[PDB]
């Protein structure tokens, strides 16, 4: 989940994007974050190879 | 025949009472500093010295008088009941933390310095400079009776 | 002050604990030579049946299994858990929660000083203040041993209270059987233990009500089929051999009282 | 063009992640989730060793 206290232990997605306004017509800001990890469950298939050249 | 029992007590939001939401961001507040979470001779093994609400210098270093005070400590993975941290730093492994400094409120009777003691006038003045409103007007101080 | 700075509420403190739990069988069988060639006691020429001795046996174990159950809920007032033979569940609760027994003491020799305004001073007043919030309606009661009441009867300053004092059929409306005594003064019920399970000498308080002091856990029992399925109050099997030759009954049961407050009982000595 | 830098962002940082994973390492560019998935895991790594000189 998104650090907002909106999903706090709520769900999670892919990619959170807000937006805001002010509301005084003077400002405006641009937010983006995610929280995601790439594992490798099985660190046994995978094989090195390493070349040696000329 | 020992009952195993666990225990916390205070959480993130009563060492800070609340905050001035900078709109134009969230960052204004905080500082991210880095520290050694372990401690530097212990094995891998013990539980760090860094309990939530110590007072630490400008260079992460913990405070020890009114002179070296720069903010709180309040990193997530030192509050109560965060302990799945034991094993996962080496001794001298050095980490980053968060600290609190500017437009805050701040809970005057868990402010600490690294030894334990609780903080004085003077390091109340060096933290009110940075425009924390340090207070104490807390209500919940004693317990149940008795 | 209007406009000034607020006040804050930032306290709060949280504790947890585990613990085993005993385990208490039982088990009968009968054979052919116990029911062959016998009456039933009280039918002079009818002839014995299986189901008669079946019935009674079964009825016998339940009074059983219901006596360990009242001695064991007893355990629970002095602080401590029922399991004798076992030092496994024997948990003492005081040090378990971390707290310690306030002792008042009562000296029934002393004739000039009333024995129940020393309770009032002592242990009413802590019971009380330490009780807590949102406890409705919890009378003190004080539960004591027979030589400890017959002493606290006779002393001087209570005969004039006791003498005035119908003790006479209210047992069967404040309480629904039980034929101990009753007294009842300044606000505090006396109540006589009569299974002995008080030490000669020695008597309890504890403020009654309070939702959730005491509990009683039950696991399941040791069978294939329930191995972790529920728990129930009392198991009963009943087993045929498929030879025709004899009979099994068995029982079991698993459980554990707890006392979750510790720090709300007072105990209780005096000399004599 | 602010939200089409963020996405495009986003996705480089994605991919390089799934690179990162596929070597058999975590991607934090932090100790707290710094990780060998052969060490977690407790496996070894298989080479095959490849000599173009011969």
């Given at each position: ?50 070349g040696?050249?000329? | ?42 094995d ?9 609400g ?76 940075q ?16 | ?22 385990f208490?069988?039982?088990d ?51 602080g ?46 802590h ?23 017959s ?19 209210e ?24 299974s ?8 309890y ?58 720090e709300l ?8």
């Amino acid at each position: 989940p998104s650090d907002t206290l909106r999903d706090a232990n709520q769900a999670a997605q892919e990619l959170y994007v807000f937006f805001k306004e002010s509301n005084y017509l003077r400002e405006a800001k641009i937010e983006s974050e995610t929280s995601f990890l790439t594992v490798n469950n099985r660190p046994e298939l995978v094989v090195k190879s390493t070349g040696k050249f000329t | 025949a020992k009952a195993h029992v666990a225990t916390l007590e205070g959480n993130y939001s009563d060492i800070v009472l609340g905050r001035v939401v900078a709109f134009g961001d969230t960052g204004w507040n905080f500082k991210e500093v880095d520290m050694t979470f372990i401690a530097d001779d212990a094995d891998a093994d013990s539980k760090t010295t860094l309990f939530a609400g110590v007072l630490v210098g400008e260079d992460g270093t913990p405070a020890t008088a009114a002179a070296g005070v720069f903010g709180v400590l309040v990193d997530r993975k030192v509050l109560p009941g965060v302990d799945h941290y034991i094993g996962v730093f080496e001794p001298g492994e050095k980490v980053p933390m968060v600290l609190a400094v500017r437009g805050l409120t701040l809970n005057q009777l868990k402010l600490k310095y690294a030894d334990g003691t609780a903080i004085d006038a003077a390091g109340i003045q060096a933290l009110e400079a940075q425009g924390n409103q340090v207070t104490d007007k807390i209500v919940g101080t004693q317990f149940i009776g008795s | 002050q209007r406009g000034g700075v607020r006040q804050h509420l930032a306290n709060d403190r949280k504790k947890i604990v585990n613990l085993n739990i005993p385990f208490f069988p039982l088990d009968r069988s009968i054979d052919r030579a116990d029911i062959q060639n016998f009456r039933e006691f009280g039918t002079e020429n009818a002839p014995a049946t299986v189901d008669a001795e079946v019935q009674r046996h079964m009825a016998r174990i339940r009074r059983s299994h219901a006596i360990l159950k009242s001695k064991a809920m007893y355990a629970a007032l002095k602080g401590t858990s029922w399991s004798p033979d076992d030092p496994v569940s024997d948990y003492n609760y005081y040090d378990v929660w971390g707290a310690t027994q306030t002792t008042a003491d009562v000296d029934f020799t002393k004739l000039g000083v009333d024995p129940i305004e020393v309770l009032e001073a002592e242990a009413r007043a802590h019971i009380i203040d330490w009780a807590g919030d949102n406890g409705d309606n919890y009378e003190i009661v004080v539960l004591a041993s027979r030589q400890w009441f017959s002493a606290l009867i006779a002393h001087p300053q209570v005969t004039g209270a006791y003498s005035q004092y119908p003790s006479t059929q209210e047992i069967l409306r404040r309480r629904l059987n039980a034929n101990n005594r009753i007294f009842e003064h300044k606000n505090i019920l006396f109540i006589e233990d009569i299974s002995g399970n008080i030490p000669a000498g020695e008597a309890y308080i504890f403020p009654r009500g309070i939702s959730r002091m005491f509990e009683i856990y039950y696991a399941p029992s040791d069978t294939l089929r329930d191995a972790n399925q529920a728990a129930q109050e009392l198991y009963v099997f009943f087993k045929e051999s498929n030879y025709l030759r004899e009979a099994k009954i068995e029982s079991e049961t698993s459980f554990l009282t707890v006392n979750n407050r510790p720090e709300l009982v007072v105990k209780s000595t005096g000399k004599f």
